[PDB]
Every structure is written in structure tokens, then in C-alpha cells.
Write a protein that binds this DNA or RNA. Structure first.
Lengths: 59, 460, 109, 182, 458, 166
RNA sequence: GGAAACUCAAAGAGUGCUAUGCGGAGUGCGCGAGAGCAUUUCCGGCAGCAGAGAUUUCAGCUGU
């Protein structure tokens, strides 16, 4: 129950899965700058303002 | 012979004065830090357990609720903390969501209110002051559309014209409203779809294909000239107002309850129809509904996107709303409470943080979207920790007990029974289909996304 | 601890400054030692403008020694590396930190 | 160890550094504080005996109710435990599971019967006295507190003579005779 | 971007010896791109570590490294370390087993007669000093100075910081060797009965009653990198064990006769063992290959201990002999006793120290100093061994300047992040893997006589 | 959208920039109404950017009179047009957060490129900065606030009641 | 048996404490500008000239 059952969806075999999981991301095994740049979410919203639907390009 | 040892020296490591902070000297050696995988795996277990014990999503309702049951909800798309809300006894209100009470309320129409939106109108005889007062509008069952003012108190530029600045009159009933978010031109679904602006009391255009009513409609957020609608022909009809014409129609199996466009992709929308799944359609290729969000048990009443464009929210006729990621097709999270019932209109607040659910028992409620996060500013150690183990749960998502913990919710047992008997009959249909596929020559494979489409005008 | 973030913000300039032959590691570890102590005393608790002043003084002196060993060893005015702007830009960064933390004293201003 | 916060206490409930499950509520510690037992393992060398006699009473109840080996050995064991004073009455064989206790086989020890017949006033003081060598049972002196007594010898528990506590209590009552050297 | 310790900082993978999906392709190229960036920026820290390891060298051709007196180095070294080289003399109680903490902060001495003292040794601080009358074979600390378990005559006891007892273990019916797996919070015991048994000391549970089926356990030793316990029995078998499966994982056959001691390198990569056949073996562990085998050292090796810089320590009864550069894979790095005619291709030992008349019962290095605590009959001695310690300890886990508040917080942090007792594995990187079955490439539900010829047709 | 706020003190006016916006929907929550009681998490919202003290105590009484009648005085005009950025035509109207709807229209008339907000959110972080107070300035003032408002209180009371001097 | 401390050890609570994120330009756009785009466009070279500035720094030219 520790190794997963099959290969999950975005990957295709176990070399893909293990090459994903090969680097720990904690601040122990990695530096602070590489930590704080390795971890940040894909979206990142500012907390208290309305989000406009984007209208780009040529304003 | 040269001898040197460590020179620990007890000054760089313990501070000279009693206030400044000591070093934490630090060696990033894999030799030093022994178990990478097991340690951060257990940190992922602790993170999933912590979100399952911090998932407290219900914020609170707002006001004492309506009288008969919320059937229409419209956020305003240019301010955060207010939304309009109309219930089908006839009563429409303009809620302020900071203090959680209304600015004003009115007995709007005789019958049901069937649609309402908000507007930044432009009259040709006025600087329309869209900052000291705020305008909504509503179409209803008694063949009337009413454009309405609200004396709002958010600014203090001033120191009076409260309700019903003008009325539109239609020959048949009305069902839906939305407004072109420029040039004050809005559009109504009734027995036939009419396009009109706020400056003239007649429909500027008929727009329908033929004789079939228009159950809902919605404008676009960008390419604002384009819009979509859903008719009781079980049909999606896209209209373009530049050519002033309908432009394509597809017919599906069961009736589409409610459309909502994408704010980010701008040519993808979501239809919520009465078979128990929502359909993330494209626009340019309307023959393959490019995602199907499946996990419901009854008719899906409405849906809208998050403003961040990648997480949508469906509210359905079973007493439960649920929030989907865009690129999965199954429930990220289920919200339900015992007092909410037959939840009809769920919308997403304009900062992608709160989920407003207007039910049928009258109440309109607030929820958080990320049900485990909290809404205060965080010191950067908390921000780094929560973001860290968020990423950590994300990469250890497929371990078979992190998955069962992060997948475990508690659904009401009506939804539990309906979901499991839906599972056993779907397995039965799959088995009997497998038997026919074993024998018969050509029963061709149809995709799950292409299954529900029964037709499309303009094949190419 | 953001002191670790500043302390490994300052690594690449000394990396290039060591791999070109003007310092050796046996003394860039010494200036890294004193820089560690200065950063800790700076963004610790109960700090002071005199700590900021001594950090500015030390960084200006190691800038002058950098230019001195640049014109002595390499016999050029600069080596167009990352270091030459970096050391005074982080002096300005120290100044910015000190003005934000202590906008009182017009001496430091 | 830190009086953990609410989320930490929720994330680990089963931690307890002090009291584990296999301590059985620390009853060996509790009763050896109750009866002031000097050495370790004395509780368990009593508890082995308690488990032994309930094992033997189990096997004797298993043996059928007619044979003289069973009836003679069960009345023999009951009389032996009465003669060691572990019981108080010659009761039923059901009291060989309700009434034999490690507390009872402790209660026949020397300092606790000494405190029981008020020779000392607390059991710690009784271990003080019989570790200093003042008491005897019959003729012979007792130096170790592990000597539990029999039903017979709860009567000749007396101090030795020239024990100066005996001299001080006799001179308290001023019946201090000094021809008998104490 | 060179980063010479990249060969130290790499993390290997289960490999084959290119795709078609564009999204998967770009995801993989981003993944290994940020892997290379994280490895380079992680190995950009050796500029930031404070001080280098100590060392010595002959810097002549006449004198040698091993014939250097402790008096001489105690004169030529600084006052603080020369003062830290303590020599306790305790005579009346027995031989003194020595266990430092995981940092260098405390020290636990056990006399075989009755005497256990947990004390700070850097500052002289009595924490818990108790004479319990029965014999104590060995003892250790649990996670801090706050708890220490003593293996008494039969029952194993654990004790508080001030000397009170907390648990008389009803199990561990005897004990000879204790150890503590620190990240797992597992107190592991082995002894005269053939029972290796594990105890989760946090929740007070047992974990594994493993039957050894090999008589008593002559010496046990923890692998500090995958947390398997290496027992060495009377057969010469050094069998290494995990609490998850009863059968011993891997049964090395190192020596002949009984195995006297085992010691694992802190990188998990080498195992040094001494037997009663007068033999010492160095072992690869990750490939299970006998590296080289010093046969016929002139007396039975009593104990071996390896420092944190790969530094071999062999106790030859009254001797302590230390080899540097003994844990390579060459033929030069076999530890010998003589450079025959001055041969520059031998390991004449790094240092040596002959004691007076007292058998040394256990070596053990000090974690973050350059000195080893050796325990003998009449007491304890620290020996200044100048290359025997990580100068750059990592203060995120264990700290030799740790105060009370950060002591409580560091132990409760490890108590939340205790690894469960099942994931003790022969290799630590087999948790995020897939199963060995349920094959690698995933499938997405799309692919799951002429007269006889005349007398055919019938 | 609350970019600046103006806090009126006994010693003089202060104008704060707003770094992070407070949350608008969950403003009645426990975890949001406690961050205006925590100082180290209130300073993640509000940065001090200007502080003009009153020159004399007579001008202090004059400014207190002008604020109590809701008028704009000249020192207030000075600090506002120093700190507030001039906007373009109607896009991005700059925004103050003041404490009363009567001071609203007067500075709207004095500055048509400035918009005034006094809602629950504005009064919320106003009372946050009033609670923490002199810890925001880190000594950047010449005055102690309790004794300053003692003197200002007796002055304002006396001038309101026309208490005689003979 | 009661009482002194800089005797130590272990817990708890309160008060605090900030707890705290290629470059000058020049060149065309972005509604007097930098909040981005983009660079050989000269430079961040050499000595001297002479205007300055506290020996070492700036201001404009010759070649380079």
C-alpha cells in the first residue's frame, strides 16, 4: 500500500513517474531559494480585488 | 606535523547579546538528511489529514433569507461585495455581502421573477453615475422587464430615486436576461429571444430560429458581441450581434438548464443540462463537448466559472452543490447542508474565493471555494508552509491512502444511495454493451463526450 | 528564516568571483562568515542603525578590496563579471532595508 | 511534553510518554508506594504467586468433585493460605479469586503488620526501625523488610531488649525496669 | 554551474538503459530542467557552510600519523578541545558502556555493576545519576536527554530526565543491545533470547516480536540510512532485519565463529564487522559485495565504530586503532598494520592509542566534534581524533546549542513527522515507486496423404 | 480598492498607503477581525507614508474645529495634495479611506481627481490603526497622544462652551 | 522538620518583539511620463587638454 497501483494519468510509465518523484522539495534537501521558487501555485491571486475577464491584445 | 581540529569558537553559533538570533548553520547533504521519500510522504499524509480536519466551508447565510425561494442570482461584474437576488414570489433584493444584509428590497412583479442581471447603462441624456447608485434589471413572468436603481452606499462623494427608473413591456412572457457588458444592450429569453437597449421601449431585434421558447441565455465576457442561449428544444443556439443573427444550433438529449461562458478561454462555455452532468463545450467545434463533468445524481440546475477560469461550480436539483476542476471531469469537492434544498442558482464571487448558493427553501448562502484555506493575510512562514504541503499533496496524490483520505467526503445518504445504484446500473449497461460488442460486427465506439449530442445544424 | 534567503542570494557573485582568480575559497568563506553574522544581526530582533552602518562600511571596504585585487591581479579596471555591479547594488539594498526599518534618523537618511 | 496545540492533539491522540497501555495503570508502582516496598520486582514475585494459586484453584475446580486428592488438596491449600494469614477467614474457594490479592500478600509483610499493631506509626518509620535492627519475631532478629509473617507470629512481634525505643517508651510510662537490662 | 559535489548531490532513478504527447513532453522537460537547477543550486551551499573539517598530516618523511601522542596533540590543539578531552576515572563499578546523544550534547555511562549516569559532559551538569543494584548491560538515549532506556539484569527499563523510572517493560524479557531508530521513534532491543523486538516508544506500543532463529544476538547495529537493524549472531551470520516482515531480509555471512561487533557508516554504504576469528571485514551494503577482509589481526577485535567522515575504529582489547581512508573500494584502502619497507600503498593506521591494562568495551564517536569516547573498565576517556567529525552539522534537525524551547519544539516536530513502522525498507526510495507487478506502460482502455485429401469433408 | 487612508490625530495628520487589501466578503469572520488586533499582521496591510504634525497647538484646535464641522483645512489640503497621485481623465480614480461621509464631499470638491470611501471596510481598518496607534509611526513624531488629546480636549470643550476667562 | 540563590531541572500562563519580499542612457511604440516591449546606438577602455571638485574624483575635445 505504499507503491501506487498503476501509472497515473499525465504520465505513461513508471520511468516517467519516478523521474517526476526523484527530487524532494523540502527545505532540508533543497536550498531556500530553490525551495521558494520550486513551490508556488499555478494561479496566484491577490486577495481582495475583483478579477476582470482578460481583454488582450491591442488596448 | 600540522594538527587542526574543529574551531567551534562559541561566538558565531550562540549570540553575543541576548536579543539577536542565533545562526542555524546548515548542510544540505543527502548524507545528512537520511529519508527523503518517507519523510515527505508522511508530511503529505499530515497535510491531507489537516485539510480534512480544517475543511470548514460554510461561511454564513446573508440576511433572514427570502420568502419563497431564490430563483435568480446575479453578481455584479465590477464590484466585489454585492449581488442581486430575486425570489419567485416576486421579491428582488440587492444584497451587500460584507455586512451580509440588503441595501434595499422590493416586491418587483406579480408572478415569478425569472431573470435578473446588473447593468452599467448609458443613456444619451445623462452622465450615468455608476458610483453613487447601482443599477440592476429583471425580467419576469408577467411579461415585463424592469430596469431598477439602487441607492448604494460604498463611496462618499455625495451629500433619492430609489426604484423603477423605467419599464419595458413585452407581448409574451420572459424567462432569461443578460446584458452585453458594453453599450447597454441587453437580451431576453421569452417565447422568442429579443434584443433591446435601455434607450427604447421596443425590441430592437427578434432573434429566434423558429417557434421554440428560450429557457436561458448568457452573454460573453469577452468578444462581448457573441452570446449563447438554451431552448426547450433541448438546444444550444449561439447568436452573434454583429451580424444580428443566430449562427449555430446543436440539439442534445436532455434539456440544457443553464449556460455560462468562460472568462479566460473566451470560446469555451459550460452547459448544465438535465442529464446529471455538465458539459464543457468549445464554440468553434461544437460536435465534441470537450469535457464532461459527471458526478451528480440529479438535474444540474446552474453553473458558473470561477473568475480565474479553471475551476467551475455546478449546483443541481439534488440538495448539493459541487465544485469541479476544469481539466478533470469529476468532483473536486461537494458542499451540502441539511437546510439547503433543491439548490437552483449557484454563482462564483468575483475574487474566486466564495461560492454563493441560492437554494429553493429561500436562503442564499456563502461558501468558501478552497474549503480548507482561510481568508486572512498570512505571515510568510505560514504562506510557505501551506503552499509547500499543497504542492506536496499534489505530487503524492496517487498514493493509495493519501488518495482515500483526500477523496473521502460525507455525502447525504440520499445522494449515496442514488450514486451507488447509478454505479450498478452503469456497470450493467457496460456489461451488456460488452456482450453485444463481442458478437455484433459493427457497433462502433462513440466517445463519452460525443454521446449526448443528438444533432448539429451546420455539420461543418 | 529569511536570513538564509539573503545569505544564499549573495552566493553567485562570490561564485564567479572565486572561479576567476581574484579571491580563493579559504577567504571568501571568511567574508561569508562575517556576512552571515552581519545579516543575522541585521534582520534579528532589537537591531539598530549602527548595525546597518557597520554592514555598509564592511561592504564598501570589501568593494574597495575587490577593485584593488582586480587592478593588481588581473591588471584591468573590471572583469565584466556579475560581481562589479552586485556589491554596490546590495549596498543600496542594505540602505533600502535600513530606511524602511528605521525612517527616523536623518543621519542614516 | 509540550501540552500540544489543538491541531497537534488531533493529529496524534495515542501518544502518551508517561502512561502506556502495558503499565496496567501503574499498579505495581502505586501499591509499592502504598506499602513502601524497598526493592523492585517484589510486586511481580508476588503476582507470580497470585497467578499461581488461581491457576492451581482453576485446575482443582477442573478436577471432579468426588476424588479425595482434589478435596484434600483444596482444603490443604485453603488451610495453608489461612496459616500464612493471607486470608482472614477460612472462606469458600471463590475467595481464591475474589480475595487473594497482591495487596493482601503485601499486607502480611513485617512493616505493614507493625504499623497495623501500632508498633511504629507509619510504614516508612517501620522500615526505618527494622532496617536499624530493633525488632524480632520470637527469638531471632529481623533485618530485612521482605520477611512476611505467618498467622502464628503476629503475637511475638516485639522489639529486642536494649532497643532504646523500648527503653524510651518504658521510661515514658516510667515502668522502666533496669534489672532486666532494658 | 560546475559544482564538484554534484556527484554527491545526485539522486539516481529506476531507469530503462522520446514520447509523442506534447503536454507530457513539456511537463517532463520542465521536471528534469528544474531537477538540474535544484541540484546545482543545492550544491551552491558549500560556499555557505561555516568551517572545514579538521585533519592532520605528517608534512615530513620521518614521523608518521599513528605514533603521535595524545599529550602532543593536547599540547598543540586549542584550550577548549584540550579541555573537552575528559578522562573520568570510576573504579568501583564495572566496565562502562558509553552512549552519547545524537548530537554531542549529553553522555550516558553504564557500569556493569549498577551505575548509570546521564550527564552533560561539555558543561559539568548532573542530570540523572542512579545506582540500581542489579547489573546493566547497555543503555541509550531515546530522542533527547529527556529519556534514556537501560537494559537491566532482565527487564528493560526506561527513565525520565531526573532519574525516575517510567516503564518496566514486561516484554523485552531480557536485553543485551538496545538501539533507537530516531526518525521512526522505535526502541529496538535484542539479546540472549532469540527475539529481536521493536517498540514504538511514542504511543507505547509493541511493533514486532521477530524471532531470530539464530540463538542469542551477539552484536546489533543500526543502519543510519535505511533504518534496518543488522544483527550479528553466533554463526558468523550478520542478518539484517526490518520490522515489517518476520524472515530476515538479507543474511550476510561475514565472519567465522561469533561476530563480535558491527558498525555501519553514516552514509549507509559500508559495514565494518569484527568476529572472534580474529577477522575484520568491510562490506558494501547497497550492492552486497565484500569489499576487503583484514584477516588475522593479532587479537580478537572487540568493537568497531565508524565516524561521520568514514573513519574506522577498532578496539583490539587494550588498543584503539583508527584508520583513515579505509572505506574506499580500491586495493590500497585495505587497512593494514605496516608499510612493508616503507610501502606507500598501505593504510598504516591514522592514529593509535594503547591503554594501560583495561579492556575497552565500546568505542563510540562524538557526533559533531573531533573526538571519540571510548569506554573501558576503569572509566571513560575522550580521545582527540582530529578528522572524526562533521564540522558542518545541520541545525534544522539536531543542534549542539539547542535550548529548552527549541528542544521541545524539535521533539514535537519529529513526533508529528514520525515515519510509520512499515516503511522500514531495504532501500529508502521505494515508496513513491509503482508495484513491481502491474506492468509499466499504462493502457487507457482501448486494447484490454492423397487418400486423406480424398477423404476430407467427412 | 482602498489605496490610501487618512488618519487624523491630535498631533497632526497621517496618510497611510495600503499594501494588501483586506478581504471584502469574509469581513465579519473571526480570523479577519482578529488580524486588526494582532499588530504584526496589521502591519502587513498598512504602511505609513506621510505624517505632517500640527505646527502649533492653536492650529491643533483649529484643525479639530474644522474636522468637527466637516470642513477642509489648509494643512489637510497640503498633506492630501502632497501624497495623492493625480489621475488621468476618469480611468483609475484614486481612493482615500476617510472616517466620515461629511468630510467626503468637501475633499471631493477640493480634489475632483480623488474618491472617498467610508464604508465598514474603511472604518474597520481605521479603528485598527487607531487601536495600534503610535506603534505604527516608530517614533516619527514630536508628541505623546494621550497628553496631546488631554490638552486638545480641554481646549475644544472650552471653545465650544465659551467658558469665560475673568 | 521550616527559610536564603546568580542553586539547577521540568512544565504553564502573561507581557512584550516586526513576527516582517546586465547598467547610464539613447532609440520607436505604452495616455509630460515610466509601469513593459527592443538594443551595438555610444559607453561602463587608453593617456593628454583644460573647466571644476577633496593625492583621488566629475565636466566637455584629440587620437583610440
Amino acid at each position: 500500500k505504499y507503491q501506487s497501483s498503476a501509472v497515473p494519468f499525465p504520465f505513461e510509465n513508471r520511468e516517467q513517474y519516478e523521474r517526476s518523484l526523484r527530487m524532494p522539495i523540502g527545505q532540508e534537501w533543497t536550498s531556500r531559494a530553490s525551495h521558494q521558487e520550486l513551490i508556488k501555485p499555478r494561479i496566484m491571486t491577490k486577495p481582495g480585488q475583483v478579477i476582470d475577464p482578460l481583454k488582450a491584445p491591442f488596448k | 606535523m600540522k594538527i587542526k581540529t574543529i574551531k567551534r569558537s562559541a561566538d558565531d553559533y550562540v549570540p553575543v547579546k541576548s536579543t539577536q538570533e542565533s545562526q542555524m548553520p546548515r548542510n544540505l547533504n543527502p548524507e545528512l538528511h537520511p529519508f527523503e521519500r518517507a519523510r515527505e510522504y508522511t508530511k503529505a499524509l499530515n497535510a491531507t489529514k489537516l485539510e480534512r480536519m480544517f475543511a470548514k466551508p460554510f461561511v454564513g447565510q446573508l440576511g433572514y433569507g427570502h420568502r419563497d425561494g431564490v430563483y435568480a442570482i446575479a453578481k455584479n461584474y465590477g464590484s466585489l461585495n454585492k449581488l442581486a437576488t430575486g425570489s419567485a414570489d416576486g421579491v428582488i433584493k440587492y444584497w451587500n455581502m460584507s455586512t451580509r444584509e440588503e441595501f434595499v428590497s422590493f416586491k418587483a412583479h406579480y408572478g415569478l421573477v425569472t431573470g435578473l442581471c446588473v447593468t452599467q447603462p448609458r443613456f444619451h441624456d445623462k452622465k450615468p453615475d455608476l458610483k453613487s447608485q447601482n443599477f440592476m434589471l429583471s425580467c419576469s413572468d408577467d411579461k415585463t422587464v424592469k430596469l431598477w436603481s439602487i441607492n448604494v452606499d460604498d463611496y462618499s462623494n455625495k451629500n433619492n430615486e430609489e426604484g423603477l427608473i423605467r419599464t419595458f413591456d413585452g407581448e409574451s412572457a420572459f424567462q432569461g436576461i443578460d446584458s452585453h457588458r458594453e453599450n447597454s444592450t441587453f437580451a431576453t429569453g421569452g417565447a422568442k429571444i429579443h434584443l433591446w437597449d435601455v434607450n427604447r421601449l421596443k425590441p430592437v431585434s427578434d432573434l429566434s430560429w423558429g417557434a421554440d421558447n428560450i429557457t436561458s441565455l448568457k452573454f460573453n465576457q469577452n468578444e462581448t458581441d457573441i452570446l449563447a442561449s438554451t431552448g426547450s428544444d433541448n438546444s444550444i443556439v449561439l447568436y452573434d450581434l454583429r451580424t444580428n443573427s443566430p449562427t449555430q444550433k446543436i440539439v442534445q438529449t436532455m434539456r440544457t438548464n443553464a449556460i455560462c461562458w468562460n472568462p479566460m478561454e473566451a470560446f469555451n462555455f459550460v452547459t448544465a443540462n438535465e442529464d446529471h452532468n455538465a458539459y464543457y463545450y468549445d464554440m468553434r467545434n461544437l460536435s465534441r463537448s470537450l469535457n464532461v463533468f459527471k458526478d451528480h445524481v440529479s438535474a444540474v440546475m446552474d453553473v458558473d466559472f470561477s473568475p480565474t477560469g479553471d475551476e467551475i461550480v455546478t449546483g443541481s436539483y439534488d440538495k448539493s452543490i459541487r465544485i469541479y476542476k476544469t481539466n478533470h471531469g469529476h468532483s473536486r469537492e461537494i458542499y451540502h447542508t441539511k437546510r439547503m434544498q433543491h439548490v437552483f442558482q449557484v454563482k462564483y464571487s468575483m475574487d474566486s474565493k466564495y461560492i454563493i448558493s441560492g437554494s429553493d427553501d429561500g436562503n442564499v448562502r456563502l461558501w468558501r471555494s478552497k474549503a480548507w484555506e482561510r481568508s486572512n493575510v498570512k505571515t510568510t512562514r505560514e504562506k510557505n508552509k501551506l503552499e509547500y504541503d499543497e504542492k506536496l499533496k499534489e505530487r503524492f496524490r496517487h498514493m493509495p491512502e493519501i488518495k482515500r483520505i483526500s477523496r473521502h467526503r460525507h455525502v447525504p445518504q440520499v445522494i449515496k444511495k442514488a450514486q451507488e445504484i447509478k454505479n450498478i446500473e452503469l456497470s450493467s449497461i457496460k456489461r451488456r454493451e460488452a456482450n453485444e460488442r463481442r458478437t455484433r460486427k459493427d457497433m462502433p465506439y462513440i466517445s463519452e463526450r460525443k454521446k449526448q449530442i443528438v444533432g448539429t445544424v451546420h455539420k461543418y | 528564516s529569511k536570513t538564509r534567503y539573503y545569505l544564499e542570494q549573495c552566493i553567485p557573485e562570490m561564485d564567479d568571483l572565486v572561479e576567476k582568480g581574484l579571491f580563493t575559497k579559504n577567504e571568501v568563506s571568511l567574508i561569508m562568515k562575517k556576512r552571515t553574522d552581519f545579516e543575522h544581526r541585521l534582520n534579528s530582533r532589537g537591531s539598530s542603525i549602527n548595525d546597518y552602518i557597520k554592514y555598509i562600511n564592511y561592504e564598501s571596504n570589501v568593494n574597495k578590496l575587490r577593485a584593488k585585487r582586480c587592478k593588481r591581479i588581473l591588471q584591468v579596471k573590471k572583469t565584466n563579471s556579475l560581481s562589479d555591479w552586485s556589491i554596490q547594488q546590495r549596498i543600496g539594498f542594505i540602505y533600502q532595508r535600513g530606511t524602511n526599518k528605521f525612517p527616523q534618523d536623518l543621519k542614516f537618511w | 511534553v509540550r501540552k500540544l496545540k489543538h491541531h497537534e492533539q488531533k493529529l496524534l491522540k495515542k501518544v502518551d510518554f508517561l502512561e502506556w497501555k502495558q503499565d496496567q495503570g501503574h499498579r505495581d508502582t502505586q501499591v509499592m508506594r502504598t506499602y513502601h516496598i524497598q526493592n523492585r520486582e517484589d510486586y511481580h514475585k508476588y503476582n507470580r504467586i497470585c497467578g499461581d494459586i488461581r491457576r492451581l484453584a482453576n485446575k482443582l475446580s477442573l478436577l471432579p468433585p468426588t476424588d479425595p486428592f482434589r478435596r484434600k488438596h483444596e482444603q490443604l491449600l485453603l488451610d495453608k493460605l489461612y496459616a500464612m494469614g493471607v486470608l482472614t477467614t477460612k472462606s469458600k474457594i471463590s475467595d481464591l479469586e475474589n480475595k487473594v490479592t497482591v495487596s493482601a500478600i503485601c499486607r502480611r509483610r513485617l512493616p505493614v503488620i507493625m504499623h497495623r499493631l501500632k508498633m511504629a506509626e507509619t510504614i516508612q518509620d517501620a522500615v526505618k526501625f527494622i532496617e536499624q535492627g530493633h525488632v524480632r519475631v520470637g527469638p531471632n532478629l529481623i533485618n530485612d523488610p521482605a520477611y512476611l509473617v505467618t498467622r502464628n507470629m503476629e503475637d511475638y512481634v516485639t522489639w529486642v531488649d536494649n532497643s532504646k525505643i523500648k527503653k524510651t517508651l518504658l521510661r515514658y510510662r516510667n515502668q522502666i525496669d533496669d534489672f532486666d537490662f532494658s | 554551474k560546475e559544482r564538484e559535489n554534484q556527484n554527491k548531490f545526485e539522486r539516481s532513478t529506476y531507469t530503462n538503459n522520446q514520447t509523442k504527447d506534447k503536454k507530457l513532453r513539456a511537463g517532463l522537460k520542465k521536471i528534469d530542467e528544474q531537477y538540474k537547477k535544484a541540484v546545482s543550486s543545492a550544491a551552491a551551499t558549500d560556499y555557505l557552510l561555516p568551517e572545514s573539517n579538521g585533519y592532520l598530516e605528517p608534512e615530513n618523511e620521518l614521523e608518521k600519523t599513528f605514533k603521535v601522542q595524545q599529550s602532543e596533540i593536547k599540547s598543540s590543539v586549542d584550550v577548549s578541545t584540550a579541555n573537552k578531552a575528559l578522562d573520568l576515572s570510576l573504579k568501583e563499578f564495572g566496565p562502562y558502556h558509553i552512549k552519547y546523544a545524537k548530537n554531542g550534547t549529553h553522555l550516558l555511562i553504564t557500569g556493569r555493576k549498577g551505575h548509570v549516569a546521564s550527564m552533560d559532559w561539555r558543561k559539568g551538569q548532573l542530570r540523572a545519576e542512579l545506582f540500581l543494584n542489579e547489573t546493566c548491560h547497555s543503555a541509550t538515549y531515546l530522542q533527547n536527554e529527556q529519556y534514556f532506556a537501560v537494559a537491566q539484569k532482565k527487564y528493560t527499563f526506561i527513565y525520565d530526565h531526573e532519574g525516575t523510572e517510567l516503564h518496566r517493560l514486561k516484554q523485552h524479557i531480557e536485553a543485551r543491545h538496545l538501539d533507537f531508530l530516531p526518525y521512526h521513534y522505535l526502541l529496538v532491543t535484542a539479546g540472549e533470547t532469540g527475539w529481536l523486538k521493536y517498540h514504538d516508544v511514542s504511543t507505547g506500543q509493541l511493533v514486532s516480536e521477530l524471532r531470530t532463529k539464530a540463538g542469542p544476538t551477539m552484536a546489533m547495529a543500526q543502519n543510519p540510512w535505511n533504518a534496518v537493524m543488522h544483527l550479528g549472531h553466533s554463526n558468523g551470520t550478520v542478518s539484517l532485519w526490518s520490522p515489517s516482515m518476520p524472515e530476515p531480509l538479507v543474511k550476510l555471512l561475514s565472519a567465522r565463529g561469533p561476530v563480535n561487533s558491527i558498525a555501519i557508516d553514516r552514509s549507509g554504504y559500508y559495514m565494518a564487522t569484527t568476529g572472534a576469528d580474529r577477522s575484520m571485514k568491510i562490506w558494501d551494503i547497497r550492492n552486497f559485495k565484500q569489499l576487503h577482509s583484514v584477516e588475522s589481526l593479532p587479537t580478537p577485535g572487540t568493537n568497531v565504530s565508524i565516524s561521520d567522515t568514514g573513519l574506522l575504529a577498532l578496539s583490539r582489547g587494550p588498543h584503539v586503532t583508527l584508520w583513515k581512508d579505509a572505506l574506499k573500494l580500491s586495493g590500497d584502502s585495505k587497512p593494514c598494520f605496516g608499510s612493508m619497507g616503507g610501502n606507500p600503498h598501505r593504510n598504516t593506521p591514522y592514529m593509535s592509542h594503547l591503554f594501560a591494562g583495561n579492556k575497552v568495551e565500546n568505542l563510540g564517536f562524538v557526533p559533531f566534534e573531533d573526538l571519540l569516547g571510548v569506554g573501558h573498565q576503569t572509566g571513560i576517556t575522550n580521545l582527540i581524533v582530529p578528522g572524526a567529525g562533521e564540522a558542518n552539522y545541520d541545525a534544522l534537525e539536531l543542534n549542539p546549542f539547542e535550548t529548552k524551547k527549541q528542544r521541545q519544539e524539535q521533539e514535537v516536530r519529529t513526533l508529528l513527522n514520525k515515519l510509520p513502522a512499515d516503511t522500514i525498507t531495504l532501500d529508502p526510495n521505494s515508496i513513491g515507486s509503482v508495484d513491481k507487478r502491474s506492468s509499466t506502460i499504462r493502457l487507457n482502455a482501448k486494447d484490454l496423404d492423397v487418400i486423406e485429401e480424398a477423404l476430407s469433408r467427412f | 480598492p482602498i489605496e490610501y487612508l487618512l488618519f487624523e490625530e491630535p498631533t497632526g495628520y497621517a496618510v497611510f498607503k495600503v499594501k494588501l487589501q483586506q478581504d471584502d466578503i469574509g469581513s465579519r469572520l473571526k480570523e479577519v477581525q482578529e488580524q486588526i488586533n494582532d499588530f504584526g499582521a496589521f502591519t502587513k496591510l498598512i504602511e505609513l507614508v506621510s505624517f505632517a504634525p500640527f505646527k502649533g497647538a492653536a492650529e491643533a484646535l483649529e484643525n479639530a474645529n474644522d474636522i468637527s464641522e466637516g470642513l477642509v483645512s489648509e494643512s489637510l489640503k497640503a498633506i492630501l495634495d502632497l501624497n495623492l497621485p493625480k489621475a488621468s481623465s476618469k480611468k483609475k480614480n484614486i481612493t482615500l479611506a476617510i472616517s466620515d461621509k461629511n468630510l467626503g464631499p468637501s475633499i471631493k470638491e477640493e480634489f475632483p481627481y480623488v474618491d472617498c470611501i467610508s464604508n465598514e471596510l474603511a472604518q474597520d481598518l481605521i479603528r485598527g490603526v487607531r487601536l495600534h496607534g503610535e506603534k505604527l509611526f516608530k517614533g516619527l513624531q514630536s508628541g505623546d497622544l494621550e497628553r496631546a488629546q488631554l490638552g486638545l480636549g480641554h481646549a475644544y470643550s472650552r471653545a465650544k462652551v465659551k467658558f469665560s476667562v475673568q
